Amino acid sequence: QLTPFLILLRKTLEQLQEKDTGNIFSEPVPLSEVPDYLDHIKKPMDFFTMKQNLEAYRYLNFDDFEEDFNLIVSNCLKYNAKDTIFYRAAVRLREQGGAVLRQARRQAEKM
Numbered sequence: 108q109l110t111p112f113l114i115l116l117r118k119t120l121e122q123l124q125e126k127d128t129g130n131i132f133s134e135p136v137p138l139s140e141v142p143d144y145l146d147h148i149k150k151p152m153d154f155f156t157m158k159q160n161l162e163a164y165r166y167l168n169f170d171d172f173e174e175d176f177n178l179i180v181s182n183c184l185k186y187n188a189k190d191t192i193f194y195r196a197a198v199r200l201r202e203q204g205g206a207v208l209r210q211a212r213r214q215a216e217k218m
């Protein structure tokens with residue numbers, strides 16, 4: 108159950124959600140509100156879905172965790188026009204969440 112790596116991934120996920128101060132990536136993009144979303148985005152991602160994958164043991168190395176974080180950003184940049192709050196927020200999350208992942212990957216390395 109509890110492993111140091113899974114505890115580290117929990118801490119890191121918390122740290123990334125902290126940077127999404129608007130909570131706009133906290134849950135899946137509401138498919139009812141944007142029914143064309145799945146025509147552009149093959150694999151939606153969000154922080155709640157990441158928590159679901161984490162607790163279901165779907166991340167066994169830091170790479171796979173980071174790959175899902177990257178989808179939260181790249182999905183948002185891909186779907187939204189550049190001059191939008193969403194697009195700008197994904198850029199901000201890319202920068203701020205990148206710093207989070209850098210220091211968390213160091214801890215995953217020495218494990």
Ligand SMILES: CC(C)Cc1ccc(S(=O)(=O)Nc2cc3c(cc2N2CCCC2)n(C)c(=O)c(=O)n3C)cc1
Nearest residue numbers: 130131132134135136137140141182183186187192193
């Ligand atoms: C001017 C606006 C910022 C005002 C605004 C517009 C639409 C909507 S919403 O009801 O459509 N909800 C929504 C659509 C998203 C989205 C995230 C959300 N939420 C879920 C709850 C947090 C915001 N994200 C992350 C995307 O990347 C994306 O492309 N979309 C379509 C919500 C707010």
